[PDB]
Structures are given as C-alpha cells and as structure tokens.
Ligand binder design. Structure first.
Ligand SMILES: [Zn+2]
Ligand SMILES: [Zn+2]
Ligand SMILES: [Zn+2]
Length: 330
C-alpha cells in the first residue's frame, strides 16, 4: 500500500522523462505512479496500467475510459463522471478483441500536419494508434505535431532494436500470420510438444503446462503461443514435426501457404465477460509459465501474461506490437 499517498506517488516521478508533455502532478493526482521504465504508470487502487502518454492526454479521462470500476476513480471523480466518459467512449476494450484515404486522415488537424510535410505513413500509424488507444483523433495541431515528433523518435529506436536482435525466421512469421487458423485446425499436439522438450526448447514444467490442458483445442493454442514466444528454434521444431504428423496441414502452411480460416461463430455479439471467459480459459502466462493469464494488452488485445509478468514487457510476445496499456481480465 506504499503508493496510496500522493506524496509517495510524486516521488516515483523523479525518474520520469522530462520530455513527456503530461506532468507528474496530473498523473499522481489521478492515482498513477511511475513503475520505473519508459513512461509506464499504474494506478495504486485498480492496478490499471497505461504507457506512451502524449500531449493533450488527461489522466483522469483515460483512467475512466479503461478502468471504470476503480474505487479511487469513483471516489475522486464520482460515478456520473465515469458513466459520462463510458457513454462518450463506449466499449473500448471489446473493440480491441475484435480488431487509402480514410476519414481519420482528413480532419482539419491531420491535414494541417500533412501540409507541414510530415510523412503520410507515419501520420497514418500514429493516428490509427491514437484512435485505438483513446477512442478519439487528435484535438489540436500542437498535440498531433508533438505526437508525430515523438512517434518519429520511437520508430528510430525500433529500427536500432530490430536491427540488433535476431530476426524472426520465415517459419516463425508463417506461424504468426496463421495463428488463428492453427488454433482451429491443429489437433496433434503431443508429438510436437515432446519434440520441443527433447530439443530443450522448453523444460518439463512447460511441457506439463501444455499437456495438462483438458481439451485438444486448449492444448493447441497453448502450444502455438508458446512457440511464438520461444521464437525461431521452436518454430523450426514445429515445422519439422508437422511434416511427419500431417502432410496436408504442413503443405497448406509451409508450401502452398494457402490456409483458410473461418470462425464457427461471431463472438463479437457475446458480452465482454463471456468473450474474456473464452479467451482466458485454461491459459497460462507465457513468461513465467506458472500463473494463469490475467491481463489484456492495449491495443493489440492479446491475452498472454499474468499481472506480475506484464510490466517486464515492452512489446506483445505474440504480435510484437508496442504495448500501450494493460487491463485485468476479471
Ligand atoms: Zn485506478
Ligand atoms: Zn507470469
Ligand atoms: Zn499482441
């Protein structure tokens, strides 16, 4: 409970990057403290996490958009304020679970940025991200110019990073692009799982985690995501094993590259609770391989980690998307 006081939260912002336009006082008053990496913050009350703050962001409003049941928020701002924000920006989370001259590229603000010479693709990615993470486009030219400059710097950093780490193989990329189709169509889990163990790509604890799931499809999605997290060596074992197990599936995925996906139902109509129930069922944190998954990444919408492991990740292990916030699954 050490972060329950305003004074304690302010002290954490000692390390806060001075260039972020959102000031420590605004964040701390809204219940957030600095977790110590980048510009990641968490609420002391609800444990909601938000990152990648931009000019014009109001911490109270973002708090209510994403964490409307937080007791601190409700006490400080009132239920009316929370209902108001939820009414203005409805169903932000559910939209994440559902996931070229668009309307968003043609507002006065965005045109003003384009007319200054900002790269059009950069503007598109930055605008798209803004809408998915906040439910709205840029409000002023000063805000978008500041966000675009920051986005340019992040892209440069990403370059250096991606260029210093081992590149994803073709095989890993293929598995990643066909994640959902494989969740649906892979039924031969154990031979592949045994082979990952024998290759020391996974250990016995991790082997047990996947083998003990109670239904084939539950085992299968744990296997696939574990592969995506472990990386190139796991993808290679998967590919080689599949060949011997199911020639038709191997061919579809790695040779003809013609897998067809089709959902049995549009869960998009189910309640948020039920969508999360299904997404979370017998899913184990892919980082610690011990605790249950209990976090949804914003804005990619993936369920991959527990609450203790989330703060350690800059990017989603599944899709490599930059994580801009974390919400609890229950
Ligand atoms: Zn909160
Ligand atoms: Zn974990
Ligand atoms: Zn993701």
């Amino acid at each position: 409970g050490s972060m329950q006081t305003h004074a304690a939260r302010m002290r954490t912002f000692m390390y806060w990057p001075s260039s972020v336009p959102v000031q420590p006082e605004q964040l701390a008053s809204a219940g957030f403290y600095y977790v110590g990496r980048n510009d990641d913050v968490k609420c002391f009350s609800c444990d909601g996490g938000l990152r990648c703050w931009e000019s014009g962001d109001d911490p109270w409003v973002e708090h209510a958009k994403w964490f409307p049941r937080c007791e601190f928020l409700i006490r400080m701002k009132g239920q009316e304020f929370v209902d108001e924000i939820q009414g203005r920006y409805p169903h932000l989370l559910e939209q994440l679970l559902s996931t070229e001259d668009a309307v968003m590229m043609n507002t006065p603000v965005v045109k003003s940025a384009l007319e200054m010479g900002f790269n059009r693709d950069l503007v598109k990615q930055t605008v798209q991200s803004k809408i998915l993470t906040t439910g709205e486009n840029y409000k002023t030219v000063n805000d978008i110019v500041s966000a675009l400059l920051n986005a340019e710097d992040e892209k440069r950093e990403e370059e250096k990073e991606k260029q210093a780490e081992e590149m994803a193989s073709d095989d890993l990329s293929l598995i990643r692009k066909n994640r959902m189709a494989l969740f649906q169509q892979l039924t031969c889990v154990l031979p592949i799982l045994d082979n990952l163990l024998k290759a020391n790509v996974i250990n016995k604890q991790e082997h047990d985690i996947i083998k003990q799931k109670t239904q084939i499809p539950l085992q299968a999605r744990e296997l696939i995501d574990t592969i995506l997290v472990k990386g190139n060596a796991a993808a290679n074992i998967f590919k080689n094993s599949l060949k011997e197990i199911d020639s038709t599936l191997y061919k579809n995925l790695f040779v003809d590259k013609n897998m067809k996906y089709i959902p049995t139902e549009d869960v998009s109509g189910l309640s948020l609770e039920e969508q999360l129930r299904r997404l979370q069922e017998e899913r184990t944190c892919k980082v610690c391989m011990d605790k249950e998954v209990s976090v949804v990444f914003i804005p990619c919408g993936h369920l991959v980690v527990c609450q203790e492991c989330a703060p350690s990740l800059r990017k989603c292990p599944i899709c490599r998307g930059i994580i801009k916030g974390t919400v609890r699954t229950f």
